[PDB]
Amino acid sequence: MRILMVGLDGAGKTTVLYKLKLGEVITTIPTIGFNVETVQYKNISFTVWDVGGQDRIRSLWRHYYRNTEGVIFVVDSNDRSRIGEAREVMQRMLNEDELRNAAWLVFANKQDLPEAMSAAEITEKLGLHSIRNRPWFIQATCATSGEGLYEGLEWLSNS
Amino acid sequence: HLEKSAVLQEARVFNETPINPRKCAHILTKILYLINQGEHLGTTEATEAFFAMTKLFQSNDPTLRRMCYLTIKEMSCIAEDVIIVTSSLTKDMTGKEDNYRGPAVRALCQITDSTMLQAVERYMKQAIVDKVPSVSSSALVSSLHLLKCSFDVVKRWVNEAQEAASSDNIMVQYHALGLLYHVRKNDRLAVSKMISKFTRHGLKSPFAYCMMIRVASKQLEEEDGSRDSPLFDFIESCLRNKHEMVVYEAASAIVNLPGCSAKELAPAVSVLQLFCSSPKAALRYAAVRTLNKVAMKHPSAVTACNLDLENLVTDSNRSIATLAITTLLKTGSESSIDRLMKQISSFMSEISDEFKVVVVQAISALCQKYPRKHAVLMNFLFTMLREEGGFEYKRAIVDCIISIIEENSESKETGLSHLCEFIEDCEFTVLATRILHLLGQEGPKTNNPSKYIRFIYNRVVLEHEEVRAGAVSALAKFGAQNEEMLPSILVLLKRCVMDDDNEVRDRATFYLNVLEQKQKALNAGYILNGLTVSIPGLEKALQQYTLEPS
Amino acid sequence: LYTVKAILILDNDGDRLFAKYYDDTYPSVKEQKAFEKNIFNKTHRTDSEIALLEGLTVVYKSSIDLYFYVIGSSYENELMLMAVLNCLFDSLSQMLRKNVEKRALLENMEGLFLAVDEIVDGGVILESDPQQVVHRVAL
């Protein structure tokens, strides 16, 4: 299974990936580029493309769209200023023809932080209810603990 | 072999999910083949192929890694959004094995620009110090490329670069010292410190010696602070290692511009250093030479002479014979000229085609360059006119004529006149233009102009426009300078030849009308001797020098 | 830093089976091929370790249907250049698993491309050890 994981910078995309691959919480640098890794979960081998979220790189995601079976969209639940921006990025991503049938999994992340928005709140802000054309799911996660990560891999594998 | 479009296109699958190291590596090989076989990539498909390949860097296979380095460098400039490949190259570069190490630094650094410079530095510092020549040399050449993008990053590497310099391993040293000289330079003195450190040493690295000789060739006496001598204890002034190229480079500079003076075990003022290497095989070519030497090329010239002169005469092989002429030319000088001229006379007999033109030019050219009299030069210039009769050209008419009017003019015209007896219209536009121009300009009283006129009259009929036009205008000037001449001008110009052709007519109508009709204030003014259209330098001799041993 | 101007391995016409240009003076096919034809015409049908063409020492060798080239400076000699040319012949032979002919080169176009890039790098002599090149390259 081919997976594209994106989201704004600092959402926790690489932390998620290497928690999944190494069972370890690594010390990230901003990703100017991608990381690509293969992860085994329950007889599925997920090839995850973690593509950096800062602006220059954001402009490049479209090259990773093609062949994508599922999309992990990571959100920093503690950052309320950038939630609209996330909504804007994700909405036009939903309009992409190469992403047309891909399974849509939102991770509301850093759920560990006291003022993190809830997954329900995030669902309203991102406009997730309005997707009728394909599968979507939202999952509260904490990438450092590992909470919600495998519930994500589970949902994804049931595409 | 291949089609560039199909191969550039099918590469786009990498960009999606398929990575298949075998298939992609093949497709890459094909790209390298399109360039190698000689083809030009199409930009859209190239740009697409480049973004696709970066995915392929995930799979670490030594052949796929290799394909990827050559292909990204070739496709780098005819591609967009190339920046993504830097990370992948660093990942590869730190991976231990020469296949990755050396080839990656080179591919990475080529794509790398001043922003990216910072990233490659840790990996670069690790790769430069290597006494494993691939990694270190690739990293050293890589640093040279990077001096452009950003100087400062490269400069920090001077310590790692120096560290490589201390190897006696040929590559690691050649690259290390060569690169260092370029890098650390902020003033002469800091580079000079780098050179003195290696300088006292008897290397077994010929390439390092050579690259360094060049830095060294000028007198440096500030190497590592200061020192009391231009000294180079590495062959430049020394002859610690014998090997005919290094020996030649060193010997020609040192002799009359000491990098150090002569030592019993290392001649460096005396002519010797070249000469002991001089009898040899194909190898001889460096050895046999000269250039400069104490106090002249001539005492030097005698040693080597047996070698240069026998090959030059015997070998009608182009490859040997050329080395033999260059070597003769090198052992040459003012003195040598007697000898050089007989040999060059002889040489055309071995290779005679262009080489013929060159020897008849050379014997004249050498006489002008090295004085055996200016007259003899003209006499050689006659022999050139005789032998070739057509590989003289237009530039020759101007150069021969200008040169000639220094002394030769009355003779030259006369010689020319005789020379014109040759061949009526195969002699070319140029000879006719030379006898015509000279007979016009001198206005012979040395011989009767009537032979000259009769000779030129026939040539014009069947030869090109430019000479026939030349002939009318010359005649007009010839009229203005000498009154006597006017009757011949009239028989010639009424003819369908010297006037009334095409270009010849237009010029003639003007030139004629000014002589015939008009005051000749203009005609008089116009002839100041009846000189050429331009006065250049003496073009032939340099031309001839390179042209002969080609 | 510069010794080698270019490396060419040419069929017995001077046409490009291969050339890889360690000069920036030939990138376009027309001119890369012209160069190749130029060097092959002088040097060929007189085998020695010396040729002088274009004011540059050209060192060359031959095989059954190829002539192999290093072009370098003429302030040097054949022997310095020859060390590159010997590496070029040798390394291709050991790499391809067959001596340099048009057939070996064509047989493995990839081994040939990679092997030559290790020998010369932008006109500097990167490598000159045949053994080193061959291990360094993977077919």
UniProtKB/Swiss-Prot annotation, chain A:
Molecular-function GO terms, alphabetical: GTP binding; GTPase activity
Subcellular location: Golgi apparatus
Organism domain of life: Eukaryota
UniProt entry tagged with the keyword DNA repair: no
UniProtKB keywords: ER-Golgi transport, Golgi apparatus, GTP-binding, Hydrolase, Isopeptide bond, Lipoprotein, Myristate, Nucleotide-binding, Protein transport, Transport, Ubl conjugation
GO cellular component: cytoplasm; cytosol; Golgi apparatus; organelle membrane contact site; plasma membrane
InterPro entries membership: Arf1-5-like (IPR045872), P-loop_NTPase (IPR027417), Small_GTP-bd (IPR005225), Small_GTPase_ARF (IPR024156), Small_GTPase_ARF/SAR (IPR006689)
E.C. number(s) listed in UniProt: 3.6.5.2
Reactions it catalyzes: GTP + H2O = GDP + phosphate + H(+)
One protein family per Pfam: Arf
Subunit (UniProt): Interacts with RUD3. Interacts with VPS13 (via C-terminal part); the interaction is direct.
Family: Belongs to the small GTPase superfamily. Arf family.
Protein name: ADP-ribosylation factor 1
Organism: Saccharomyces cerevisiae (strain ATCC 204508 / S288c)
Gene: ARF1
From Swiss-Prot, chain B:
Cellular component aspect of the GO annotation: COPI vesicle coat; cytosol; Golgi membrane
Quaternary structure and interacting proteins, as annotated: Oligomeric complex that consists of at least the alpha, beta, beta', gamma, delta, epsilon and zeta subunits. Interacts with ZNF289/ARFGAP2 through its C-terminal appendage domain. Interacts with EGFR upon EGF treatment; interaction is essential for regulation of EGF-dependent nuclear transport of EGFR by retrograde trafficking from the Golgi to the ER. The coatomer interacts with KDEL receptors; the interaction is important for retrograde trafficking of KDEL-bearing proteins from the Golgi to the endoplasmic reticulum. Interacts with COPB1. Interacts with TMED10 (via C-terminus).
Annotated disulfide bonds: none
A molecular function (GO) term: structural molecule activity
Keyword match Signal: no
Subcellular location: Cytoplasm, Cytosol; Golgi apparatus membrane; Cytoplasmic vesicle, COPI-coated vesicle membrane
GO biological process terms on file: establishment of Golgi localization; intracellular protein transport; organelle transport along microtubule; vesicle-mediated transport
Function (record text): The coatomer is a cytosolic protein complex that binds to dilysine motifs and reversibly associates with Golgi non-clathrin-coated vesicles, which further mediate biosynthetic protein transport from the ER, via the Golgi up to the trans Golgi network. Coatomer complex is required for budding from Golgi membranes, and is essential for the retrograde Golgi-to-ER transport of dilysine-tagged proteins.
Organism taxonomic ancestry: Eukaryota, Metazoa, Chordata, Craniata, Vertebrata
Organism in which the protein naturally occurs: Mus musculus (Mouse)
Protein name, per record: Coatomer subunit gamma-1
Family affiliation: Belongs to the COPG family.
From-to range in the entire protein, with total length: 21 to 570 of 874
Main location: cytoplasm
Gene: Copg1
Top-level taxon in the UniProt lineage: Eukaryota
Membrane topology recorded in Swiss-Prot or TrEMBL: Peripheral membrane protein
HEAT repeat residue intervals: 44-81, 263-300, 302-335, 336-372
Keyword field: Cytoplasm, Cytoplasmic vesicle, ER-Golgi transport, Golgi apparatus, Membrane, Phosphoprotein, Protein transport, Repeat, Transport
Curated annotation (Swiss-Prot), chain C:
Major location category of this protein: cytoplasm
Coiled-coil annotated residue ranges, if any: none
Keywords: Acetylation, Cytoplasm, Cytoplasmic vesicle, ER-Golgi transport, Golgi apparatus, Membrane, Protein transport, Transport
Membrane topology term: Peripheral membrane protein
KW Acetylation (keyword) present: yes
The keyword Acetylation belongs to this UniProt entry's keyword annotation: yes
GO terms under cellular component: COPI vesicle coat; Golgi membrane
UniProt-listed GO biological process terms: intra-Golgi vesicle-mediated transport; intracellular protein transport; retrograde vesicle-mediated transport, Golgi to endoplasmic reticulum
Organism domain of life: Eukaryota
Location(s) in or outside the cell: Cytoplasm; Golgi apparatus membrane; Cytoplasmic vesicle, COPI-coated vesicle membrane
Disulfide pairings: none
Family: Belongs to the adaptor complexes small subunit family.
Function (record text): The coatomer is a cytosolic protein complex that binds to dilysine motifs and reversibly associates with Golgi non-clathrin-coated vesicles, which further mediate biosynthetic protein transport from the ER, via the Golgi up to the trans Golgi network. Coatomer complex is required for budding from Golgi membranes, and is essential for the retrograde Golgi-to-ER transport of dilysine-tagged proteins. The zeta subunit may be involved in regulating the coat assembly and, hence, the rate of biosynthetic protein transport due to its association-dissociation properties with the coatomer complex.
UniProt subunit comment: Oligomeric complex that consists of at least the alpha, beta, beta', gamma, delta, epsilon and zeta subunits.
Annotated protein name in UniProt: Coatomer subunit zeta-1
Organism in which the protein naturally occurs: Mus musculus
Classification of source organism: Eukaryota, Metazoa, Chordata, Craniata, Vertebrata
